[PDB]
């Protein structure tokens with residue numbers, strides 16, 4: 038009944054500019070009693086250290102893409118508004134803005150898709166705010182197909198895990214993973230046999246300023262011991278190349294795993310809403326702006342596919358005439374019928390990210406696919422000092438997965 | 454190469470408007486003199502009884518969906534054949550001739566991007582008569598399944614397809630899936646399936662109004678109960694002197710693995726007797742009067758709801774839904790999960806109203822291409838019903854799609870003979 042997969046948790050959102058923290062319960066039976074037993078959206082004014090409800094559970098209004106919460110509290114009537122968009126993970130509600138009387142939020146989540154195919158058998162909140170109200174988000178690590186191989190000295194066994202959810206085994210990239218039990222968050226393969234050594238229960242936990250842990254709980258070798266998996270994610274003090282998660286203890290079906298990943302650091306250290314990252318904020322100086330101008334005759338790049346042609350103009354770059362009406366960072370054109378023009382990403386919706394050695398430029402807000410998923414494009418930039426076009430290089434379409442378009446782009450401007 | 458399955462035959466086309474009969478052979482190896490061994494398009498002038506080539510097979514320029522042939526002659530003479538993906542081998546339709554340049558359009562399976570529409574073996578399925586009137590059996594060709602022939606025999610089941618093999622691999626009926634691949638005629642005598650006839654020669658016009666199709670099965674492996682005889686199937690299609698309900702093919706002889714089948718069908722009659730390019734049929738030309746114009750205070754378009762799409766029909770001059778008021782179509786498809794997707798499933802200028810074997814059918818074609826290359830097409834199966842809602846006008850009921858060909862049922866008082 039209305040996003041069932043989000044109802045058993047208390048979700049947090051913050052308004053950084055005003056130091057306001059929001060506690061959200063889509064089924065507000067809860068406990069945020071801090072605002073009362075009926076409050077669905079509880080606001081903590083950290084300034085005066087006080088709580089005020091800005092959305093009551095009973096005064097709810099629901100539709101496929103919009104949840105509204107009202108109050109009887111007069112305003113200089115206060116209410117909350119949550120715009121839902123289909124996403125490929127449970128996601129997190131993002132604070133958009135707060136007008137005089139209304140508090141707006143946006144939530145990209147698998148629980149808002151037109152098709153159930155995007156919904157995981159079991160997924161839990163995958164983020165947490167630290168003492169400073171900075172978000173540590175692991176959603177980027179969540180696999181929708183397959184899982185991660187854990188490093189261990191046991192050559193006759195493979196340990197597979199996913200993050201914050203079960204491992205999708207039916208379409209797994211690895212043949213081994215495909216032999217795993219359905220619904221398992223951690224799977225152990227031995228002698229062509231796979232065991233379910235841990236399933237998703239509670240959301241991600243933040244223990245140390247720079248440490249997050251995820252616990253999975255549920256076989257011969259267990260000798261009377263319920264299998265358990267505990268992953269500890271650590272934000273390193275210095276930027277380094279990505280590392281595989283490592284096994285630190287396999288004491289009788291009681292697995293301990295440490296994963297050094299910059300995704301465990303606060304998010305603003307990894308991302309920018311513009312085409313540049315700075316040493317001061319991200320410990321890396323990047324500026325892809327010099328790419329918006331290809332200058333010559335076409336300030337847009339083109340990337341050929343089997344059935345389509347992609348036209349890209351990034352960082353405010355000018356677009357091509359065939360898309361001179363859609364306002365698109367990335368524009369997909371059907372070859373058989375050059376009249377079908379789909380937007381695969383918009384310029385106002387850019388996220389430049391650097392984490393674990395990878396520089397990624399993500400454009401979202403594209404036209405929706407039947408699943409309800411706004412088409413989006415992610416560009417995996419690669420450093421190349423000698424890239425053609427004086428180092429600017431050129432994007433290569435590498436493929437599509439359910440309306441997310443992938444490109445690779447070798448360029449000197451992606452060299453840290 | 455160049456459409457390999459078209460070269461095995463010589464295809465006729467006609468310009469009745471000028472009494473011209475063309476012999477087409479994409480590979481030029483036709484032999485028929487009066488125009489040469491290299492002539493790809495030979496034009497027999499019936500008014501003078503002379504032949505002149507309008508296209509030489511050697512002077513060929515090929516494009517994706519276009520074949521052109523130049524000759525040595527040259528007025529102040531050449532040929533062009535436009536190819537469009539079709540679901541049967543079809544026929545090269547003469548469209549017009551200019552200042553010594555003859556045009557043709559050919560909707561055929563041999564021009565489909567996705568070779569999923571090609572049969573294991575298909576042959577020409579039409580023939581022109583002395584009056585240059587066409588007798589086309591293409592509509593009876595099944596891209597899936599077969600026709601169960603009426604034999605009255607209790608021990609056997611005899612299945613056939615028209616001008617082509619029965620698609621066994623992906624057929625619904627379990628009994629047909631037991632038939633050998635490539636068989637055009639399948640005999641089930643003993644819970645066993647036998648191939649007693651494969652296609653080879655095209656449709657032949659015997660009686661100036663009688664069509665004959667001959668399937669042969671020569672060589673070793675003849676069934677033991679056939680006694681040194683090679684199986685063979687011979688179907689005679691006969692045009693009824695008067696309109697009547699379509700009948701089933703009838704087995705009229707079954708000597709030694711030799712089958713003689715008679716099929717009384719109005720599809721055997723000249724085409725202009727079964728079809729019109731407008732929404733009306735006359736008693737004089739069609740032997741039946743029909744006018745669907747009246748179906749053309751509220752919305753001037755019809756709507757048929759489907760699971761994933763909505764279909765808007767603008768019939769006989771009617772007007773489309775404002776949502777499709779950006780192209781031009783008689784049938785327009787719009788995806789519900791994304792109203793931005795508007796596809797033309799048929800165009801007003803491409804309509805065929807047909808009456809044959811008791812069924813009244815309105816067809817719109819020229820729709821937008823699918824990845825296969827097939828232009829979308831809508832076929833509206835009309836039914837008689839005096840007590841039809843909307844004051845008899847009734848309304849279209851979408852009944853399903855099949856590879857970019859959309860079907861509809863339409864009960865209306867205007868569909869009554």
Ligand SMILES: *[C@@H]1O[C@H](CO)[C@@H](O[C@@H]2O[C@H](CO)[C@@H](O)[C@H](O)[C@H]2NC(C)=O)[C@H](O)[C@H]1NC(C)=O
Nearest residue numbers: 095096097098099103105106107108114115116
């Ligand atoms: C929410 O408060 C508003 C104000 O009285 C009520 O009216 C509108 O309700 C719709 C949906 O219910 C909202 O989309 C509008 O924004 C509301 N109007 C505005 C702008 O105030 C609404 O009835 C209240 N919700 C309840 C208690 O049902």
Ligand SMILES: O=P(O)(O)OC[C@H]1O[C@H](O)[C@@H](O)[C@@H](O)[C@@H]1O
Nearest residue numbers: 369379405406407408437439440
């Ligand atoms: O929304 P649908 O019907 O699932 O179609 C989705 C498809 O739409 C268009 O054809 C293109 O954008 C494809 O890349 C995309 O995958």
Ligand SMILES: O=P(O)(O)OC[C@H]1O[C@H](O)[C@@H](O)[C@@H](O)[C@@H]1O
Nearest residue numbers: 786796822823824825854856857
């Ligand atoms: O050309 P494609 O990629 O095979 O798609 C064909 C399909 O396109 C759209 O989704 C609709 O028109 C369907 O009815 C049609 O079958």
Ligand SMILES: [Os+3]
Nearest residue numbers: 258287289290
């Ligand atoms: Os073990």
Ligand SMILES: [Os+3]
Nearest residue numbers: 707708709710
């Ligand atoms: Os017999």
